[PDB]
Amino acid sequence: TLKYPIEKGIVTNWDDME
Amino acid sequence: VSPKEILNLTSELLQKCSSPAPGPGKEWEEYVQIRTLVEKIRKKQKGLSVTFDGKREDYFPDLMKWASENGASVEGFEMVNFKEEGFGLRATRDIKAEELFLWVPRKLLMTVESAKNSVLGPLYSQDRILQAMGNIALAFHLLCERASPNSFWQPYIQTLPSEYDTPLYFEEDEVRYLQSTQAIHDVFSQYKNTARQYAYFYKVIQTHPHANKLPLKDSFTYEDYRWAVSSVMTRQAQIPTEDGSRVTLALIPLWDMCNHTNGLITTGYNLEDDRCECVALQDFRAGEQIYIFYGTRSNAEFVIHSGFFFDNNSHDRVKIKLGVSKSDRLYAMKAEVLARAGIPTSSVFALHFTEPPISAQLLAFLRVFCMTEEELKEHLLGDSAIDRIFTLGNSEFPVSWDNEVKLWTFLEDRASLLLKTYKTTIEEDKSVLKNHDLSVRAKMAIKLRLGEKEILEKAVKSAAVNREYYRQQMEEKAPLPKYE
Ligand SMILES: Nc1ncnc2c1ncn2[C@@H]1O[C@H](CSCC[C@H](N)C(=O)O)[C@@H](O)[C@H]1O
């Protein structure tokens, strides 16, 4: 398959206080 | 109007958006109050600090030339403004499935590493937030380069959208459609995070001497930050660093013009040639839009992080929270069985729309949740106990007919109870969509709340079919399948 699959718009955490 | 007035308003916004959570029953009220302060700031500012004279399609030729000069693929497709998805790529020749048709070398990317080596570097080296969260670092990298006329990435930035459909751009009444859903809490958090971050960084840029050289010091509007974080959240990707030992977040030009369809991930990073590579998800005839598969996300994540609602999303799901209660007289045994199965005592599981509705882990949890004392003992003691645990997630090997009847009864009842916590029914949502004329953003919100209930209703129906099936097996006293 893909060794480094790339996810467009991957969900990240934007909570700077968490 | 006055720089002192903006400073005072942002200080108030910072205090408001740094206060702790007010409790779920007051999050709507807090949301409106934060919106009120943000809209007062926004109406006293001039929108995007940097605007461009041409139309969006006027700059795609320079994007192609710039990408071509640096080794990207630029033949076989063209940019087209599609009504449904906005701008995307259209094939100008036939492209066969699995054909490598798109590649982007690392030099064109905007990354956390290129953010460090840019004018933002000095502030990055001191501020703890930028160091801990590469997505925010990417957003300011994007803003700084946008405000830099001689930036290497100007051909890319000038072709980005000027506006998005993330919930940061919704009207108050468009978000109000989401009241009583699971999704609305994340909408609240996104608005509160964004407003807090804008106010924090506004005050930092104005006073911290490490921001002295920043082009943002001349003008840094709320609209700037909303645009930058929406650009990053709808487009960023995870890639390996040049060495391959760590990962990083990146904006990938040209490739990020592809819109989404159902399928499999066909984009990977090639570390030996140091470039992103994308093979065709399916055959694309000349004149057909080129799509990719973004990833296995729910419609709540597509709306909130990706700025759109995707019909017939095969990976949609809703959350369901379940736990063994410490007041159960069988808590200790149930907790031990789950622990030996690698399952927590309390967790947030998912319910899916496609078949089956529940995963192997949720099935395993529900079986233990409903086990009698003698069934728990057989999963804890003797030479077959480990084998019994191993099949706990397997639909073909139930613990007992009565255990299945009980767990599907509970699930049917729980999903029906969740359905009753929504402010509207499925029939009402469908009537609104049919008999009201709505904006794209309002439709996103209504289809999102409808989609939550439709997953719950299908879980109800599948659980009732499972309950009746296993009840028949109990009546007939059929032999239990054994694994061998
Ligand atoms: N299947 C789809 N339906 C609707 N909008 C889509 C879509 N796939 C992608 N999009 C849109 O495209 C964005 C991802 S970036 C893709 C290029 C974008 N259309 C542009 O004009 O720059 C999403 O935020 C959403 O606005």
Author numbering:
A (entry chain Y): 66 to 83
B (entry chain A): 19 to 502
Which of the paper's sentences describe this entry?
Here we elucidate the structural and molecular determinant(s) of target specificity of histidine vs. lysine in the active site of SETD3. On the substrate-binding surface, the residues are diverse, reflecting the fact that the three enzymes act on three very distinct substrates—the large subunit of Rubisco by LSMT, RelA subunit of nuclear factor NFκB by SETD6, and actin by SETD3—with limited sequence similarity immediately surrounding the methylation target. To facilitate the methyl transfer reaction, SETD3 provides a local environment that promotes deprotonation of the target nitrogen N3 of histidine (and concomitant protonation of N1). Most (if not all) SAM-dependent MTases use the classic SN2 reaction mechanism, which requires the target nitrogen be in a deprotonated state.
In addition, we determined the N255A mutant structures in complex with H73-containing and K73-containing peptides, respectively. Pairwise comparison between the WT and mutant enzyme complexed with the same peptide revealed identical overall structures with root-mean-square deviations of 0.4–0.5 Å across all Cα atoms. A small movement towards to the respective target residue (H73 or K73) is observed for Trp273 in the absence of side chain of Asn255. With no H-bond potential with the imidazole ring, N255A mutant reduced activity on H73 methylation, whereas the extra space generated by removing the side chain of N255 might provide flexibility for multiple round of K73 methylation (see below). Indeed, both N255A and N255V have enhanced activity on K73 in the order N255A≫N255V>WT (N255). This order of activity on K73 reflects the size (alanine vs. valine), as well as the potential of making H-bonds of residue 255 (asparagine). Comparing to the WT SETD3, the variant N255A has significantly enhanced activity on K73 peptide. We observed monomethyl lysine produced by the N255A variant at 10 min, dimethyl at 30 min, and a complete conversion of unmodified substrate to trimethyl lysine at 1 h. Eliminating the potential of forming H-bonds with an increased size of active site enables the N255A variant to be a competent trimethyl lysine MTase.
